[PDB]
Design a protein around this nucleic acid. Structure first.
Ligand SMILES: [Mg+2]
Ligand SMILES: [Mg+2]
Ligand SMILES: [Mg+2]
Ligand SMILES: [Mg+2]
Ligand SMILES: [Mg+2]
Lengths: 177, 136, 84, 104
RNA sequence: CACCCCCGUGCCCAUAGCACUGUGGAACCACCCCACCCCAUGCCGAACUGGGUCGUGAAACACAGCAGCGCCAAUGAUACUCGGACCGCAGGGUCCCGGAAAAGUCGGUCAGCGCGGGGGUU
RNA sequence: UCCCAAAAUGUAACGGAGGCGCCCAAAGGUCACCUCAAGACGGUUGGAAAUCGUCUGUAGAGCGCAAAGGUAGAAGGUGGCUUGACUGCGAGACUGACACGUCGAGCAGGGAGGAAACUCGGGCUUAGUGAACCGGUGGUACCGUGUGGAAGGGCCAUCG
RNA sequence: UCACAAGGCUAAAACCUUAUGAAACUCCGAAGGGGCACGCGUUUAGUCCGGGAGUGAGGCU
């Protein structure tokens, strides 16, 4: 699935849109990092298992339990307690989850007009903010307990935001013009 | 005056001025000719004296600072431990060091303002001006 | 028994016997085993034919002549260059 | 990372051993499998694959190990110690050793 | 050391390092490519690891330029000081005689000496 | 442990500061792999640090506790397998008035991890300690009051 | 690392120019001192074994 439409309409288009003398100088998609940041306010031995079920169905990968950096500050801060949940996607698994988004995830969002187009990770990388969860194809209230949100980041081989933004739009990306 | 936080107590020793130019900041300056311990209240006297003389401006640079604890005689003793931190704070001042420098005021408006300040100091001094170019 | 502290604050009698330092110097005929240095960390790291004890102590493996290698400062070595 | 070669190299305690070093550049499909004497900054044997391999690239695995074991035996190199780069000692690299271990 | 060059490895840990500009590709090297199993990711072939071409030298590497930053750093004079001899009630200071910094300044550098294998001089 | 301590060691005071009388069957052995604190920009709980992402990044982190030395080619951080946190010894040193205290290559018996070179007789090191006397317990079968046993003793080990 | 002087700057931390203090700060770093080898020299002690001690209040510069 996909990969060829990524070439056909983006790869030669960019070499004409810009002035790339090589097919390897042309920007790519390194990885899509999915990060769940529960805990702190949701410190439950039950919530850790709950987030895993929701994630291992959308991405179809086992999620790592990114523990606390042993920080003992004034507020609720301690040693090695489970706090956040991470899932790194590359290749087919990245492309399957990315396609599940532009075609199914992204349009099926309430209050949707697009995503913030401003210069994100200055050195050509994108960071997506998803305020909800009950908007995804595998995410339904019929098999879940409550309601939440999540964070996703796009890593591109682009040298600047200028080259990164274009690569995303031609790939299919809604912008609030 | 006194410092914010530190170690508590110290010691004592002497030899010729290390880091004290002549110009920088101001036009005219005041220089120590004898080695001493300049008390906090001793400087606070000089500031006030010079301050009054200039009325408005405050173009006085206090280059010295009491970064040094001194101890004292509770009443008599000797039979017992180390002495009270809280006597006074001092700045070790060796000949050559600039303690004070003035800006914007005239030659005489400074000769006199420093003369008054000298009378509040435990050591011989001298007034200075320009031609001090090591680093700027 | 009063509410004041069991341990009175502000002391100073406290200190310890304490030893250390270099035992054999650059250009010395050592026997095997002869300690060349007593140290805390690795001021001097073990060189050619010189063993390092549990407490970073540096001892001779074979008889010879002590040579010190000061690699720019930070990396220091003691080795043995036999007379045989 | 790059720490891996220096880690494996430093743990190969040089002249204390007396034995000779056996490098391997299994990064490409072109080795170097050099025999280096610790003391003198000199290479004794060595067997590559760049000039003639017979088509093989990761299959030549034993061949270049067998070639070296034979190449060393001529000079009388009997006592040796191996040193991988970041190479986990499993395929292409484990062969070169198992072929030298059996090849003399 | 025929002259160049590339891959390994070394003595040497900044006079060897970084940034910025450039030259390099079908010899070498990298990415790349797919990966079900050896074997592997507290999640993912990013990494290790396995099977190979093209494509592109992009990124990385290699070489070359340059003194903007780092790094090295004089000479002169000084601080200090062994020894000798003195001043001042004291803090402190001096003279002779050798040893002599640190900082700074002139200025120096975009390294140098090896072993092995590979590829070219149509 | 640091300073005093006068760049070898050592050095006093009712001189200046601070900690110890433990802890860990993994926080040990070994073999693998991993690399930190912080800032800037960007992102759902959040919005001061934070779970993530990309740049900078000799260390500004970490090392069970005090500090100093030390340390990323790891002593830091993960895992697999394992108890060398062994018995018999100790060439040669350190250090002390002695009594103590420390480091130790190598040899034997049996092992442990590793493919292997090898490494291991506790912990990155420097604190976590207590002579001797009398006695408790496990082993050993050396003495044993005419003789053979036994009581009692001795010898290893270890507890108070 | 801790302390600190005039100013810039920004929403004060940082950062920049000018400027300092340090037993428990150190990118540096002497003169001296210590170990070892040699004696080109000049000297005259030392070490070990055994007998007998006294001294373990020191004082000034
Ligand atoms: Mg310098
Ligand atoms: Mg002299
Ligand atoms: Mg003198
Ligand atoms: Mg006198
Ligand atoms: Mg002189």
């Amino acid at each position: 699935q996909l990969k060829t439409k990524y070439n056909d309409q983006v790869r030669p288009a960019l070499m004409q849109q810009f002035g790339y003398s090589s097919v390897m100088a042309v920007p790519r998609i390194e990885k899509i990092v999915v990060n769940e940041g529960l805990g702190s306010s949701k410190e439950d031995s039950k919530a850790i298992d709950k987030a895993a079920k929701e994630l291992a169905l959308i991405t179809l990968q086992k999620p790592i339990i990114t523990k606390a950096k042993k920080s003992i500050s004034n507020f609720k801060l301690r040693q090695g307690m489970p706090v956040g949940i991470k899932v790194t996607l590359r290749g087919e698994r990245m492309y399957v989850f990315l396609e599940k988004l532009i075609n199914i995830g992204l349009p099926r969002i309430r209050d949707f007009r697009g995503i913030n187009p401003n210069a994100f990770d200055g050195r050509g990388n994108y960071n997506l903010g998803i305020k909800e969860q009950l908007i995804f194809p595998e995410i339904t209230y019929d098999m879940v307990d409550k309601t939440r949100g999540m964070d996703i980041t796009i890593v591109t081989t682009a040298k600047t935001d200028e080259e990164a933004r274009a690569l995303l739009q031609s790939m299919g990306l809604p912008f609030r013009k | 005056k006194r410092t914010k936080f530190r170690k508590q107590f110290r010691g004592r020793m002497t030899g010729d001025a290390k880091g004290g130019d002549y110009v920088a900041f101001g036009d005219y300056g005041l220089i120590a000719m004898e080695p001493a311990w300049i008390k906090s209240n001793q400087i606070e006297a000089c500031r006030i004296v010079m301050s009054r003389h200039f009325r408005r401006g405050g173009k006085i640079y206090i280059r010295i600072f009491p970064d040094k604890p001194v101890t004292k005689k509770p009443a008599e003793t000797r039979m017992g431990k180390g002495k009270g931190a809280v006597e006074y704070w001092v700045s070790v001042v060796k000949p050559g060091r600039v303690m004070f420098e003035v800006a914007g005021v005239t030659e005489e408006q400074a000769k006199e303002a420093f003369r008054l300040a000298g009378h509040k100091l435990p050591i011989q001094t001298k007034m200075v001006k320009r031609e001090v170019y090591d680093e700027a | 028994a009063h509410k004041k502290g069991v341990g009175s604050s502000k002391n100073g009698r406290d200190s310890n016997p304490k030893y250390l330092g270099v035992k054999k110097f650059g250009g010395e005929v050592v026997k095997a085993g002869n300690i060349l240095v007593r140290q805390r960390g690795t001021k001097f790291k073990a060189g050619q034919g010189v063993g390092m004890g549990r407490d970073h102590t540096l001892f001779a493996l074979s008889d010879g002549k002590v040579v010190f290698i000061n690699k720019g400062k930070g990396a220091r070595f003691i080795s043995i260059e036999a007379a045989q | 990372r790059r720490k891996l070669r220096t880690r494996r190299k430093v743990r190969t305690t040089t002249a204390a051993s007396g034995r000779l070093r056996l490098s391997v550049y299994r990064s490409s499909k072109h080795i170097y499998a050099q025999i280096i004497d610790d003391s003198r900054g000199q290479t004794l044997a060595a067997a590559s694959s760049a000039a003639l391999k017979s088509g093989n690239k990761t299959d030549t695995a034993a061949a270049v190990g067998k070639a070296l074991a034979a190449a060393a035996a001529e000079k009388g190199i009997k006592q040796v110690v191996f040193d991988r780069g970041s190479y986990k000692y499993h395929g292409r690299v484990k062969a070169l050793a198992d072929a030298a271990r059996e090849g003399g």
